[PDB]
Amino acid sequence: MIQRTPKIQVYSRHPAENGKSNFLNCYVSGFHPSDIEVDLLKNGERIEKVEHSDLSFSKDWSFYLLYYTEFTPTEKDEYACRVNHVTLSQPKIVKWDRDM
Amino acid sequence: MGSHSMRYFFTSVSRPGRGEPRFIAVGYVDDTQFVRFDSDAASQRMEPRAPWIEQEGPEYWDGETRKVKAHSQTHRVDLGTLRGYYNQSEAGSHTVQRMYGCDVGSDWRFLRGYHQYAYDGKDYIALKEDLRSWTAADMAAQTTKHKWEAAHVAEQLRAYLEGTCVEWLRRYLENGKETLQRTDAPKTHMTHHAVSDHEATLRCWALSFYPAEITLTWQRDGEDQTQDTELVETRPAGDGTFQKWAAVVVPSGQEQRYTCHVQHEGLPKPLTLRWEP
Amino acid sequence: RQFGPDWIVA
Ligand SMILES: [Ca+2]
């Protein structure tokens, strides 16, 4: 019926400092229907230990999930979130920017 | 911390190729999730998600499991019925959603109750605020409305929403008070980002707050400014707290004219940040 | 504490 494409934010739990353990988050929201694929990426490669929150929804019935993993940021490593949903032709990649 | 809510959120998604619907249920007090059920998990039990619900005894967990399983079978039947009402094919996946719960006011007494149902992500049927009458969005929902009026569903839900619901919310608030009745005011700061030789971005940050409701507003020379600003959606930190930021683009050198104003339940008066540093 | 266990079908 209505398909709503996901909004994506990618960010750390705590202010990022190199060498300090932290959590990398990918928050996906405003989507329908609920089936979604989300991976967290380190230098383009899929991270295995990622967890996610239990599915819930907003006032407008759209869904939201948080996907997250522990990580230790470094100066050179790049992180991103890759999302696929029925509203997307191709998976969408959002890079982590530590100031956002 | 002023008014409080208890809400339950249910999503059932059909699987036409094989088997029964995926059913997910989650329960919240305010912005804290405290229970889950997922039909694809191994336990087949309602499970705790907050430490202060773990002290509930096995009769509680057995009852909650029974209720949530029976709720799941009702949504299984509903997905079949609504497919019929809408003359849809048996080939596609469809979704039911239900949310219900209650609010108490700062007087600690019942404030409002709700029970809302959606099919494929649009309103289907909803109990009105009087808890006595129904809003049906279309002729399929009208049929449900007639069924539900004849079964006195409003009356049953009203008794729960005004009685049980409020009584248990109050119980949870006291058992979980160390966290549920603690407000975490936002930890704020501003950052500065040159965008060109002639302009800069100020970004106001609100971090580690609870509950999630917050207002960040920029002002220039004491007047609200929305042009040349950006505001992200409030987002979970993953430790139970929330984050947000707001940014404004300004002429380099004129940073001092701008102030960020932060409003939050944990702040007795709003905070004002200004780039001086 | 949820409502139930009698959830009336649509
Ligand atoms: Ca896709």
Numbering used by the authors:
A (entry chain B): 0 to 99
B (entry chain A): 0 to 276
C (entry chain C): 1 to 10
From the primary publication:
The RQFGPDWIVA sequence (present in C. asparagiforme) activated the 1E6 T cell with around 1 log–greater potency compared with ALWGPDPAAA. Additional small movements in the Cα backbone of the peptide around peptide residue Asp6 were apparent in the A2-YLGGPDFPTI (KD = ~400 μM), A2-ALWGPDPAAA (KD = ~208 μM), and A2-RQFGPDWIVA (KD = 44.4 μM) structures. The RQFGPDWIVA peptide, which was substantially more potent than the preproinsulin peptide, is within the proteome of a common human pathogen (C. asparagiforme), demonstrating the potential for an encounter between a naive 1E6-like T cell and a foreign peptide with a more potent ligand that might then break self-tolerance.
We demonstrated that the TCR from the 1E6 T cell clone bound to HLA-A*0201–ALWGPDPAAA using a limited footprint and very weak binding affinity. Here, we solved the structure of the 1E6 TCR with 7 altered peptide ligands (APLs) determined by our previously published combinatorial peptide library (CPL) screening, 2 of which mapped within human pathogens. Concomitant with our global analysis of 1E6 TCR binding to the APLs, we observed a common interaction element, consistent with our previous findings, that utilized TCR residues Tyr97α and Trp97β, forming an aromatic cap over a central GPD motif that was present in all of the APLs. Ligand engagement is dominated by peptide interactions, but hotspot-like interactions with the central GPD motif enable the 1E6 TCR to tolerate peptide residues that vary outside of this region, explaining how T cells expressing this TCR may cross-react with a large number of different peptides.
